[PDB]
Amino acid sequence: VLTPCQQSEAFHKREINEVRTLENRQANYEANSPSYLALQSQIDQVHKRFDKYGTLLCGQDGLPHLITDGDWRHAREFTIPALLFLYITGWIGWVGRSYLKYTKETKNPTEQEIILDVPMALKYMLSGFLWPLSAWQEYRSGQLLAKEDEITVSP
Amino acid sequence: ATKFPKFSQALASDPTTRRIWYGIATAHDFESHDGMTEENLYQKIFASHFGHLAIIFLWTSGNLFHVAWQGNFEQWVANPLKTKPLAHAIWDPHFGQAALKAFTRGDTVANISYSGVYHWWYTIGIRNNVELYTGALGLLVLSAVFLLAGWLHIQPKFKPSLSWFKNNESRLNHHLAGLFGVSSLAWTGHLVHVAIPASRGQHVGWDNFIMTPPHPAGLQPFFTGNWSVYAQSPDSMQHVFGTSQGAGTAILTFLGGFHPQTQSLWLTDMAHHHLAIAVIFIVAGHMYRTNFGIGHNLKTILEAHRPPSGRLGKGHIGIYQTLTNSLHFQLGLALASLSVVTSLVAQHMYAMPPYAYMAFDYVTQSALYTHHQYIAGLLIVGAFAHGAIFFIRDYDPEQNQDNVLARMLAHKEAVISHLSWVSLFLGFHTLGLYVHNDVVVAFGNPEKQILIEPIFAQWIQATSGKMLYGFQVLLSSSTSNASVAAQQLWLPGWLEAVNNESNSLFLTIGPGDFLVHHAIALGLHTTTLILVKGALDARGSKLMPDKKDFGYSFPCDGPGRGGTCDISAWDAFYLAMFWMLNTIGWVTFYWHWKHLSLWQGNVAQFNESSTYLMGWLRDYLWLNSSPLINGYNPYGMNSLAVWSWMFLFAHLVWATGFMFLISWRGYWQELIETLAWAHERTPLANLIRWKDKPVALSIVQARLVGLVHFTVGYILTYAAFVIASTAGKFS
Amino acid sequence: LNLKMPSPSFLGSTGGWLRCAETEEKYAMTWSSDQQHIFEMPTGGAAVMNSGDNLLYLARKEQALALATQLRTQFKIQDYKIYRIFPSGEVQYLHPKDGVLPYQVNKGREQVGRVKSTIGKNVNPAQVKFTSKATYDR
Amino acid sequence: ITDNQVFVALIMALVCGYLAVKLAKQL
Amino acid sequence: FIWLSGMYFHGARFSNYVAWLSNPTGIKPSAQVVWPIVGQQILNADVGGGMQGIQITSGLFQLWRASGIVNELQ
Amino acid sequence: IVIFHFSWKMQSDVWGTVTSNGAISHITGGNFAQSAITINGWLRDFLWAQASQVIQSYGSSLSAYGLMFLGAHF
Amino acid sequence: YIHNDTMRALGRAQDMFSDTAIQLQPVFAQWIQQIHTLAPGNTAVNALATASYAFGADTVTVGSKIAMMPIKLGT
Amino acid sequence: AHTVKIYDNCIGCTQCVRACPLDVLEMVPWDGCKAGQMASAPRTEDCVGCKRCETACPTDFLSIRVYLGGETTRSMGLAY
Amino acid sequence: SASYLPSILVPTVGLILPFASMAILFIAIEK
Ligand code: CLA
Ligand code: CLA
Ligand code: CLA
Ligand code: CLA
Ligand code: CLA
Ligand code: CLA
Ligand code: CLA
Ligand code: CLA
Ligand SMILES: CC1=C(/C=C/C(C)=C/C=C/C(C)=C\C=C\C=C(C)\C=C\C=C(C)\C=C\C2=C(C)CCCC2(C)C)C(C)(C)CCC1
Ligand SMILES: CC1=C(/C=C/C(C)=C/C=CC(/C)=C/C=C/C=C(C)/C=C/C=C(C)/C=C/C2=C(C)CCCC2(C)C)C(C)(C)CCC1
Ligand SMILES: CC1=C(C/C=C(\C)CCC[C@H](C)CCC[C@H](C)CCCC(C)C)C(=O)c2ccccc2C1=O
Ligand SMILES: [Ca+2]
Ligand SMILES: [Ca+2]
């Protein structure tokens, strides 16, 4: 079973354990001196991190468990980062494909591939901010998928 | 002809030591012999199968004889939990006083049987050593009978014709009805006449099985129609196995869970199960057409399956002849099915212990699970290798036009590309998550690791009956139609067993299980990728379009065209063998660690250490290796000394495999030339002259020797580790 | 031929032909030169080819051919003949076998090992199963 | 398992071996 | 020479060389300070001498002491 | 193998602490005399016993080493 | 090494290549160590101590830690 | 006893004969190319399978194919 | 019981059988 970390004793126990681990090393140093301030910042960050993670769900071990079933209540856990990742990598892939398609139109595409043409490379990188829309219309026009490619014996 | 090979003049004429090696390797490749014919090939295979069945029966008979003559079955039946089973006596002239005392089990020096044969034989009804001895005698007679049959069928008068070997309709109708059906019905009869009475304190043997009836009501209810009389009085739930306390008369009950005292499936439920299975098999054994004018023709069924849209091309038109005339396609299919069945056997045996008291014996449980899983890996890899051999040697595209198989070869590139993408995605993501958790935990921030709950698997567990997750779907919800339907039949007992939390039935899963299951997926996909790529690209490739012309196993095509090392399909199999060992190693690693944490009563260790690889190396390989590596030390020795020495021996054979897997032929050829010069240029030793010119191991021979060394080391190392750890931890 | 022909001045070496060459095939190379050149023996070492006629024995045909290749490349010596001697004593003319280099087209040579069309027309192994025929065979 | 029983088993094993040697030589 | 200059600069700027000189046996040599970004700040071991960092086993401190270095200006 | 011998021999017969009055206590008290004569001893008293420090380094300043211990394996 | 593994596993410790069992002492190396130990007074007249305490002489302790002590060689 | 086979796509460039280290190949008159010559393998008994000729062939797909078959003393390159 | 059978068979199958089989096998492969 899973329960919110804010209501799980294991989460608070872990927070106290980490704070104690930092305080043990912090006691050796002096209040105002090199170090000791370095450990106080860590303690504050620990408090903020646990307060932030309290909204997540965790079992008996107290470790935040992420629900990827697609439930809207857990969209921020996997749905939103998943969509943002797909957007970033689709942008990377689409700009790369367009740059390759442009280089193939040059006299020596190999030289362009080795020595990248920063002007055109940046021209295609800046664009593509609407790659999901550019992927379509390329597919509809038939300019995305090919027809005949290299195939060996016994196709 | 007159030399060692005797079946290949090409190898017999070889004047180097390579002839003996290749002759030993190509001894079973009947299809590649010089004077070979389809009829002779099939007849030789028939005789080989007889001689193999005899070897299997001789092995089982040996096990029974050793357990009855040197084991302690009689002393183990009385107290199956207090004592431990004995495999066989140990007679080694090198054993010292300390070794003899350490391996002494009380009366003689023997080994602790970890194969679980004691529990199986005790569950089927064996209670005396004389019974085991009689069983061994019967199996020896059976082996002799099969040996005689094998020799008889290889005679010219009793040689089966090729047409008889290709009668698929009859072979299937007789295997599904008799080999599978009648055999199961007979087993059910044995359980009702021996296993159940023996478990209920009433020993029934050949002398009284015709006298005492299994059921007090006799066969009258079966002939009348009301079969419920056979399930009227089951065990009282407090019955003691082997005694008559709280016993019942039901021979075909359908209880749900396991017997509380033995934590094993009820024998009555097993008999009822085999009865239903035998009925279904005997019914399905009448599907094909025989000389009686009733049934089906495999060819007609295959040719009638063709989608009208044409998505699958010409359907299975031609598949029948392709499979019937090809033994490799048949062997590939059989191996694939047998591998899935042997892995399903392990998965079903650990979760539902069938043999009494098998659950308590942790060592045997782990050994058997790992045993069957490793054999399953070898079987599926062999199925894929035979499929590749079928494509190169027993596949003619001329006769397979627009066939499902031909179409598979047509879009092979798409299949390989998608398999590669799946394997890459799984690897990148699973290893990324494992290392991310490892890094965050290393920096003292365990709460920052990414733990993804296996929601889908937990949902399937709940649908089955699990209530820990609180999903309340299907059998987990008492108001569900499925639950209400079976509420009065098998649901109560099954729900009690699934919710026990102590047995291995539907074990509680967490984030660690999700991550390792994804790793299991990565391994399965990468192994099938290598094997599928080997089978599809076995006939040709852009690098070598004429690969089919060079056979299935050849070294290479030289350094031309950039290089062609491991181009052959055999090398794809040899590359997939390493991945199978890795995948099965991960599967067995996860099973053994999950079960070790459950048995010791500390599941939190697994729940919190399986998320990162550091835990997999510290809490599993290092922590549990202490009793294993401490078998013998300067202070003294233990009974586990054999396992420690075997563990080191396996480490050594594994490294020896690395030897052949790294160094290739050419350094050794020159080295052997140098050695040859030394031998023929030294006095007092020139008289001795090699009959066969020394030569280095061939390229392919080196790959096979190195793969065998690596495989032997992998298996022996994990066998020693698992047995020693499960023994010292709980012994 | 001309077993009494002078031999290059070599100081032995442990890479020469072994006993196997005595009871089996033993190749020989006889070439003529005009300058006492120093050449690397195929067995490992350095030798001086006697001005005039040079004859040496080797245990492999590839060794003799490699020596001939270096004699033709490092030096402009093209009159190199490679023979084969059997334990019985009968000599056999192997290289060039016709007085013309193999890569130089010459009349009188009959094509051996020729297959019609390209390799893409080779039959499948399944079509020549259980028979003494190969894919390359038409 | 009496000594005589073990001897009987050994005799049967020898018969099996003879049959398995004949079967192999025939193959 | 660039690598050597780097070692000397690390000793002068991010190392407890003077503290080590005062107590060579008690202070652990260290000349690397890890930035606090992803929890890696834990690598800054309590080597002593006020500063906390990664303990160096290159013998730079002992070599510098044998060479007569006493202050970080050198 | 050479570095393994140096490390084990030094930690079992040279490197160690000395208590007042001259009592000597090595890191691994004389175990190399009878444990370095067997492969099992080389795997138990050296590779297994001494690895506990690199596998349990997580959560401390040495965690990095442990991480590198795993990465190297990969 | 393999023989010692086999002996220890069989409980036959009396048949091992160790100090207690069959002994293989580096007599030559031990002898060189002894010669080095005696060198500061018979072959190194102006030397006041052995080049390295690893050959012999006495042990050196700094900060309650061993610096260099004789490295005895055995089987 | 390796089998060396020449196919009709040969252009008569002689690179296979020039790269063969066992005098297994040669050039013979032919009329299938302007060069008027074709590669031949009349001394396949001396072939070892090094495939130097296969590497030296310029045609798209090697016009000369060496199949490793029976192994003898010559094919194993044994000087002993 | 036949405690003497193992002592008579283990050495035969571990020393007699392997050497004899290897000798016969060597003669067969060489001749
Ligand atoms: C799958 C079916 C099956 C299997 C695997 C077993 C297995 C077993 N039974 Mg059982 N039995 C069965 C069916 C089966 N039984 C049925 C249907 C009945 C009811 C009639 C019985 C009644 C029964 C009794 C009363 C007893 C057993 C016992 C046993 C055990 C010892 C047998 C023995 O003493 O050595 C014999 C070993 C053999 C292999 C017997 C030979 C059987 C083969 C099939 C006959 C072949 C003959 C010949 C070669 C034919 C050649 C012709 C050719 C042309 C093909 C053993 C584990 C005994 C026991 O120990 O209790 C646990 C016991 O007393 N059984
Ligand atoms: C133009 C860049 C580009 C694009 C659009 C693609 C696109 C694709 N690749 Mg590919 N790939 C690339 C580069 C690219 N790749 C490079 C450089 C390599 C060598 C490391 C590979 C190796 C590779 C393999 C092995 C596979 C694919 C596959 C695929 C397909 C499925 C997704 C995938 O698995 O990606 C995987 C991506 C990687 C493994 C690494 C990508 C490398 C970098 C991070 C991205 C490229 C950056 C590029 C330099 C940007 C140029 C910008 C320009 C404006 C200057 C997909 C159509 C799979 C397939 O076969 O299809 C089913 C497959 O198995 N790729
Ligand atoms: C009823 C008639 C009959 C029967 C009983 C058999 C039986 C058999 N035939 Mg046969 N056959 C028949 C008719 C029959 N045949 C006819 C009419 C033809 C001509 C069309 C053929 C042609 C034929 C050929 C050409 C061959 C056979 C072969 C075989 C043997 C298969 C190997 C084996 O291990 O079997 C037993 C198999 C099983 C019991 C099933 C496998 C296990 C599955 C997965 C079930 C799992 C059970 C269970 C869970 C395990 C419990 C645990 C255990 C520890 C107790 C087998 C004994 C082969 C052979 O071996 O030759 C000697 C073979 O080459 N048959
Ligand atoms: C019922 C199962 C079955 C059957 C009937 C066959 C039948 C056949 N196989 Mg196949 N195979 C199988 C399963 C099977 N296989 C499995 C499970 C695998 C994966 C492991 C393979 C992988 C495989 C490959 C890669 C090849 C074959 C080949 C062949 C054919 C020739 C075999 C030969 O001549 O070599 C005879 C076998 C040997 C001489 C044994 C080799 C030595 C073993 C591997 C050493 C292992 C260690 C040993 C047990 C000692 C350990 C001691 C230590 C523990 C102390 C033949 C028709 C070959 C072929 O098709 O020819 C072209 C081929 O290349 N098989
Ligand atoms: C554990 C793995 C392993 C093992 C055991 C070996 C063993 C050996 N390698 Mg090596 N090697 C390996 C890995 C391994 N290598 C790897 C991974 C590579 C890739 C880089 C190499 C690459 C390599 C090269 C390039 C060379 C060697 C050479 C040698 C040999 C050195 C000669 C010698 O001292 O013999 C001693 C034998 C052993 C140490 C093996 C165990 C001996 C035991 C103690 C005896 C047991 C006998 C006993 C009676 C058991 C037998 C029972 C009987 C019934 C059969 C030796 C046999 C060299 C060589 O050719 O020889 C000079 C050579 O130059 N290897
Ligand atoms: C010179 C040092 C050395 C060497 C070379 C080896 C070599 C080996 N050891 Mg070993 N070991 C050593 C020291 C060494 N060990 C020491 C000092 C100990 C403590 C005494 C052990 C204890 C030990 C145990 C207990 C075991 C081995 C095993 C093995 C073998 C593994 C076979 C393999 O291919 O790897 C396969 C590698 C893996 C399966 C990964 C190993 C560990 C990771 C952390 C597990 C992660 C599992 C995870 C779910 C997988 C997915 C992650 C991914 C998606 C990112 C191999 C021969 C194992 C074996 O028997 O072979 C199977 C075995 O169980 N060793
Ligand atoms: C595969 C089955 C098998 C196996 C693995 C073993 C293994 C063993 N037996 Mg046993 N034995 C068996 C069958 C088997 N036996 C059977 C069926 C009988 C009843 C006759 C016996 C009777 C027997 C006796 C009386 C004794 C042993 C003993 C032993 C041990 C020492 C070996 C020996 O010297 O005895 C020799 C064994 C025989 C001559 C019988 C051979 C029969 C088997 C089945 C032949 C193997 C064929 C196999 C199926 C295929 C081999 C394939 C391979 C070549 C690739 C050893 C652990 C001795 C012992 O206990 O020492 C501690 C001992 O005293 N056995
Ligand atoms: C596989 C079966 C097998 C068997 C049955 C034996 C049995 C034996 N081994 Mg052996 N060993 C084996 C395999 C085997 N070994 C293998 C595979 C290896 C390689 C890894 C070794 C390596 C090995 C070594 C290194 C040594 C032994 C030794 C011994 C003996 C030790 C007994 C003892 O402690 O007292 C000692 C008992 C005696 C000294 C009396 C000697 C009895 C002789 C050897 C038998 C009689 C022979 C006879 C004269 C010849 C035939 C008859 C003749 C009249 C024609 C013992 C007789 C030890 C030994 O003593 O060697 C002789 C020993 O040094 N073994
Ligand atoms: C929601 C979710 C989920 C999901 C799942 C799934 C199952 C999915 C899928 C899917 C699929 C089943 C798909 C398919 C496909 C196919 C294809 C075919 C495609 C494609 C594409 C391409 C081909 C390309 C692209 C591109 C772009 C656009 C970018 C870059 C460039 C390129 C061009 C590359 C889960 C449940 C997990 C959880 C929750 C959440
Ligand atoms: C190479 C090759 C091949 C192949 C290979 C292999 C290796 C295969 C395999 C395979 C496999 C290995 C498979 C498996 C499978 C499985 C399946 C197909 C399944 C399924 C499904 C279902 C129907 C289910 C159901 C259910 C139920 C009943 C209820 C509960 C739940 C569940 C879901 C379980 C061949 C010969 C053809 C050809 C040539 C080439
Ligand atoms: C060690 C090694 C050798 C040398 C190994 C040799 C020469 C084998 C010698 C030992 C054998 C196994 C023993 C032979 C003696 C037997 C008693 C003969 C019995 C009959 C057999 C022929 C069946 C190679 O030739 C080689 C080639 C390619 C890659 C790696 C390697 C490699 O690692
Ligand atoms: Ca009974
Ligand atoms: Ca009876």
XYZ file of C-alpha atoms in Angstrom, chain A residues 19-116:
98
model
C 19.828 16.139 9.594
C 21.609 14.237 12.370
C 24.281 12.998 9.965
C 24.965 16.568 8.848
C 24.872 17.980 12.397
C 27.385 15.407 13.647
C 29.983 16.750 11.212
C 28.813 20.341 11.740
C 29.511 20.200 15.487
C 33.243 19.674 14.888
C 33.582 23.057 13.158
C 33.075 26.545 14.628
C 30.012 28.756 14.094
C 31.745 31.516 12.084
C 34.700 29.959 10.239
C 35.412 28.105 6.975
C 32.922 25.241 6.905
C 30.024 24.912 9.423
C 28.189 27.329 7.141
C 28.591 24.802 4.343
C 26.771 22.205 6.464
C 24.020 24.609 7.558
C 23.125 25.291 3.930
C 22.916 21.524 3.415
C 20.550 21.162 6.379
C 18.288 23.898 5.016
C 18.281 22.230 1.603
C 17.350 18.919 3.244
C 14.391 20.539 4.989
C 13.196 22.145 1.755
C 13.629 18.917 -0.226
C 11.617 16.863 2.254
C 8.884 19.502 2.443
C 8.754 19.428 -1.366
C 8.627 15.616 -1.575
C 5.962 15.340 1.134
C 3.302 15.530 -1.581
C 4.581 12.362 -3.281
C 3.419 8.841 -2.437
C 5.643 6.339 -0.649
C 5.229 2.959 1.005
C 6.726 1.485 4.161
C 10.348 2.180 3.202
C 9.504 5.894 3.069
C 11.058 6.340 -0.380
C 8.935 8.432 -2.793
C 7.325 6.125 -5.352
C 6.288 7.532 -8.742
C 2.980 6.479 -10.325
C 3.294 6.136 -14.118
C -0.125 4.579 -14.829
C -1.236 7.828 -16.483
C -3.551 9.036 -13.719
C -4.214 12.760 -14.058
C -3.523 13.247 -10.346
C 0.052 12.088 -11.065
C 0.509 13.877 -14.398
C 3.260 16.080 -12.965
C 5.110 12.936 -11.866
C 5.489 11.336 -15.322
C 3.036 12.775 -17.875
C 4.360 16.357 -17.912
C 8.086 15.456 -17.875
C 7.356 12.765 -20.470
C 5.728 15.277 -22.823
C 8.509 17.813 -22.262
C 11.147 15.175 -23.014
C 9.379 14.138 -26.196
C 9.186 17.781 -27.259
C 12.902 18.401 -26.658
C 14.037 15.202 -28.395
C 11.572 15.613 -31.260
C 13.038 19.077 -31.747
C 16.554 17.593 -31.765
C 15.568 14.891 -34.253
C 13.631 17.189 -36.585
C 16.368 19.830 -36.769
C 18.943 17.117 -37.424
C 16.837 15.573 -40.186
C 16.309 18.953 -41.856
C 20.025 19.772 -41.693
C 20.838 16.423 -43.301
C 18.255 17.023 -46.031
C 19.843 20.407 -46.768
C 23.419 19.093 -46.764
C 22.474 16.379 -49.248
C 21.725 19.205 -51.717
C 25.291 20.567 -51.601
C 28.200 19.624 -53.853
C 30.045 17.558 -51.208
C 27.658 16.659 -48.363
C 30.447 14.769 -46.581
C 32.418 17.977 -46.029
C 29.319 19.638 -44.579
C 28.802 16.689 -42.237
C 32.404 16.885 -41.003
C 32.695 20.692 -40.923
C 29.201 21.746 -39.878
